[PDB]
Design a protein around this ligand. Structure first.
Ligand code: HEM
Ligand SMILES: O=[N+]([O-])c1ccc(O)c(O)c1
Length: 137
């Protein structure tokens, strides 16, 4: 289920982080607007950049923190607030996060593995609604 998926992901976090983030950027080309240093580079090129692996993993580490602190795939309000208030997230709307988890859910379903896709789908929707309650546009 959800808890095991957190362990699966954390076990090889950098690899999953990159795979899922690439699936997201490729599914929603316009989203690269929030990542000017990633434009005009193939998946394999992005992989070779230090800050791509570093940032993507640090994103997914935080995401696993929030996921693990969640109850029934409902994240803590304080975790959503953290995400809203991050200076790096100044420009963002819940739409950015919604698309990320759409991509994440899609990745899981297409994976050979028994991820609990429905739980992650719920977690994503519940994060979005919590982001809104903590003040994100
Ligand atoms: C649950 C979802 C997310 C989590 C947990 C998360 C977490 C983080 C973390 C930890 C950092 C700092 C990374 C570092 O120190 O290198 C970061 C930076 C950043 N994030 Fe998020 N993030 C999420 C979603 C998003 C989304 C959906 C977008 C835009 C589509 C976004 C855009 C950015 C930008 C622009 C930065 C700083 C510039 C950069 O590192 O690319 N984040 N995020
Ligand atoms: O949301 N993500 O997955 C992100 C956000 C910023 C990054 O620099 C990154 O490599 C991934």
């Amino acid at each position: 289920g959800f808890k095991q998926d957190i362990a699966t992901l954390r076990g090889d976090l950098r690899t999953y982080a990159q795979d899922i983030f690439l699936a997201f950027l490729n599914k929603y080309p316009d989203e690269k607007r929030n990542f000017k240093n990633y434009v005009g580079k193939s998946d394999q090129e992005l992989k070779s950049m230090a800050k791509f692996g570093d940032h993507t993993e640090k994103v997914f580490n935080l995401m696993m923190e929030v996921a693990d602190r969640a109850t029934d795939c409902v994240p803590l309000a304080s975790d959503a607030s953290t995400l809203v208030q991050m200076k790096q997230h100044s420009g963002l709307t819940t739409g950015n996060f919604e698309k990320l988890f759409v991509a994440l859910v899609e990745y899981m379903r297409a994976s050979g593995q028994s991820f609990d896709s429905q739980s992650w789908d719920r977690f994503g929707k519940n994060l979005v609604s919590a982001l809104s309650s903590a003040g994100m546009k």
